[PDB]
Amino acid sequence: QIELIKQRINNIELFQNNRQAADSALRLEEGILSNAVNSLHRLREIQIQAGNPSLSEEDRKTLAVEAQALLNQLLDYANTKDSNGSYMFSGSKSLTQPVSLNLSGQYVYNGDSTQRFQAVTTSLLVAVNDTGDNVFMRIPSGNGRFAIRETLTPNTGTASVSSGSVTNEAAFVPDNYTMTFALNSQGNLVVMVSGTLSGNVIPPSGLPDDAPLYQEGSAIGFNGMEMVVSGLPKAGDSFSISPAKNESIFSTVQRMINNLNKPYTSSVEKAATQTENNQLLAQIDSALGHILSVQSDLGARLNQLETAEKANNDYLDISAATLKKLREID
Amino acid sequence: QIELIKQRINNIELFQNNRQAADSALRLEEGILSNAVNSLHRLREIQIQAGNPSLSEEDRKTLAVEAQALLNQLLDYANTKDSNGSYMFSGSKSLTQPVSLNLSGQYVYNGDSTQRFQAVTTSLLVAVNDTGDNVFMRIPSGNGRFAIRETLTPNTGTASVSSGSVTNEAAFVPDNYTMTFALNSQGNLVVMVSGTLSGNVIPPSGLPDDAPLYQEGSAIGFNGMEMVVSGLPKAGDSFSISPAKNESIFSTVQRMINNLNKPYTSSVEKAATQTENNQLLAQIDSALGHILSVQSDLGARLNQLETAEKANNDYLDISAATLKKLREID
């Protein structure tokens, strides 16, 4: 009884200590994530100009260098140390730097996915960290469901493509699609789509003459997806369309830099920019959003903690009274 | 010279050995991923019926049990051992089981994100594995960009919501949104949306009387997003709309099971199913797609390898001739 309460109060001090420390690690983490949104908000301002055809090559190659500063900024945030001199986003691997760049050239994650849960009342565990694989690395490319790149065949025309979206989830079919512009037996430009698993979808016959013709800025739709083609392509120009792929914010920014550095003087060079600009905007956003969800998650936990601070002072105010009412037996 | 070629040929045997072994680990892995698509294809058949209002409660509670077998199937695939008796999807942590279920109740990943790259020519490294955090755990919820749940306020009416999509990437704003149905001063039902960061968006004033009215099966749009509301809600009914969040296939299936087990007899119970059915279909798909991208990645690597088998027999056919032409000096 009394040795039991003694050990209950010993439990409570630990539960309050664990809470105080959780509350703090998490608020430190809110501020790093908060910083990292700042960086992305600006990367988004930047990406939007990269799609503005006013800007001189000089203006853009200068944004390229700002984007390089922002990339470096985000690597510092991902590799932040918390109160101990151990990394906040590395998971259980406390002294391994979470994000680095192999000589392969891609950025990798050297942590794990393991969260420390902590007792902060008798039956509530709360996570006191997040991990880099969740926060920074796995974010889908494209519009979140499908991505659009050029093929190995550079395009000769001025065609560009929106990020588009899935409009009918039931009609949706994941596949590797190829969109090929070519000719009617009449002479009209026409739009074809086929795919590894699906064979021909537009049109099912694959015949140019059974094919829909290309209206500038018109919505092309197949297997649950819609997108819009702008500019004037030439026959043989092609785009590839593929399931979304996990891809770090880091390579997203590496990519905004590669793009700001492309030739951007002739109308033909400027359209090979746009298709990819539209994509990179979606990715910057996907990532803005993804981090906000990590922030929302973190908020919920803090509200679980401010819950626990009232509930541990309730469970002590009660143990104190069990002592007063038990010492009265004496 | 000759001791140099001797050591080149020693390098080549290792490059060919590394390739042979890579080619094999990857094809074993294609087949597990291939199996895992099979499981999801069926989970998708299942999810679609779960939204069919023909089915008896008995039919559905039976699919619930099939879905439980499929979940278990996918855990076996995630926890597969390759040729050694070490786990294929655990990363560098070869003898840690990758996916398990804490008593918290959620499924976690106990591996890391680290790929073994292997020399298979003089200047080509190829990855011979993938990791569970990429393959199974981080897949965005909802339609890939935003998700839709009920609030803590159960709904009294028969309203349901599509998975919707982002239609204008530039207008897009990640936020925590609340959609609230309520009354005109006239008496007409009306649709409101506001959000933590955005304050009121529909309408900006927040006044019911400045508000758009609710047309059944009509497209509601705000900050770059569109969605469609079906059924007849009552005032006060609400839905929540939130950035996408990483979430394992596993909890997606756990969720299809919870849903198949909900009350599904009265029209009012059947509409609290649909909103979430639509979501779960998107997630099953997001995951079908995500795995296909891991498969496409794996294919590319095999094509890098069948490249290396011709290039290592070219670099030996050349070293043999350097020996023939060097032993002739003698």
Three-class HEC string of chain B: CHHHHHHHHHHHHHHHHHHHHHHHHHHHHHHHHHHHHHHHHHHHHHHHHCCCCCCCHHHHHHHHHHHHHHHHHHHHHHCCECCCCCECCCCCCCCCCCEEECCCCCEEECCECCCCEEECCCCCEEECCCCHHHHHHCCECCCCCEEEEECCCCCCCCCEECCCEECCCCCCCCCCEEEEEEECCCCCEEEEEEECCCEEEECCCCCHHHCCECCCCEEEEECCEEEEEECCCCCCCEEEEEECCECCHHHHHHHHHHHHCCCCCCCCCCHHHHHHHHHHHHHHHHHHHHHHHHHHHHHHHHHHHHHHHHHHHHHHHHHHHHHHHHHCCC
- Contacts of the segment A64-73: beta carbons below 8 A, 24+ positions apart: A64/A257, A64/A260, A64/A261, A67/A43, A67/A253, A67/A256, A67/A257, A67/A260, A68/A257, A70/A39, A70/A42, A70/A43, A70/A46, A70/A253, A71/A250, A71/A253, A71/A254, A71/A257, A73/A39
Of A244, A265, A295, the one marking the end of a domain is: A244
Rounded CA separation B212/B189 (Å): 9
Q: Which of A112, A134, A282 sits opposite B138 (nearest CB)?
A: A134
Interface membership of B157 toward A (CB under 8 Å): no
Angle at A187 between CA A181 and CA A191, to 5 degrees: 20
Count of the separate structural domains present in chain B: 2
Together in a domain, B9 and B133 = yes
Whether B267 contacts B158, CB under 8 Å: yes
Whether A79 contacts A101, CB under 8 Å: no
Whether B278 contacts B163, CB under 8 Å: yes
Which residue reads 């009274």 in tokens? A321
Within a 10 A sphere around the Cβ of A260, how many other Cβ atoms?
27
Together in a domain, B18 and B108 = yes
Together in a domain, A5 and A89 = yes
Question: Do A293 and B170 lie within an 8 Å CB cutoff?
Answer: no
Considering only CB atoms, which chain A residues are within 8 Å of B114?
108-110
Together in a domain, B120 and B234 = no
Question: Do B242 and A293 lie within an 8 Å CB cutoff?
Answer: yes
Together in a domain, A11 and A92 = yes
Could you tell me the CA-to-CA distances from A49 to A52, A59, A221, A289, B170 in Å, in that order? 5, 10, 29, 21, 12
Q: Which of B115, B144, B292 sits opposite A144 (nearest CB)?
A: B144
Q: DSSP character for A112?
A: B
Together in a domain, B177 and B225 = yes
Together in a domain, B231 and B270 = no
Residues 181-240 of A with CB under 8 A from B: none
Of B244, B263, B292, the one marking the end of a domain is: B244
Question: Do A246 and B138 lie within an 8 Å CB cutoff?
Answer: yes
- The experimental method behind these coordinates is X-ray
Considering only CB atoms, which chain A residues are within 8 Å of B175?
292
Of A182, A214, A244, the one marking the end of a domain is: A244
Maximum CA extent, chain A: 107
Resolution of the solved structure (Å): 2.8
User: Whole domain around residue A203: which residue ranges?
Assistant: 142-244
Together in a domain, A74 and A6 = yes
Residue A6 φ then ψ, to 5°? -35, -55
Together in a domain, B126 and B194 = no
Together in a domain, A256 and A230 = no
Question: Do A243 and B290 lie within an 8 Å CB cutoff?
Answer: yes
Together in a domain, A22 and A124 = yes
Strand A199-202 and strand A189-195: pairing? Answer: antiparallel
Angle at B44 between CA B281 and CA B46, to 5 degrees: 105
Together in a domain, A225 and A264 = no
Strands (E), chain A: 99-101, 107-109, 117-119, 125-127, 146-150, 160-161, 165-166, 177-183, 189-195, 199-202, 218-222, 225-230, 238-243
- Pick from A44, A96, A109, A112 the residue to mutate for testing the B interface (most B CBs within 10 Å): A112
Show Cβ contacts of residue B195 under 8 Å, excluding neighbours closer than 6 positions.
B175, B176, B177, B178, B201
Rounded CA separation B286/A143 (Å): 12
- Cα-only R_g, chain B: 27
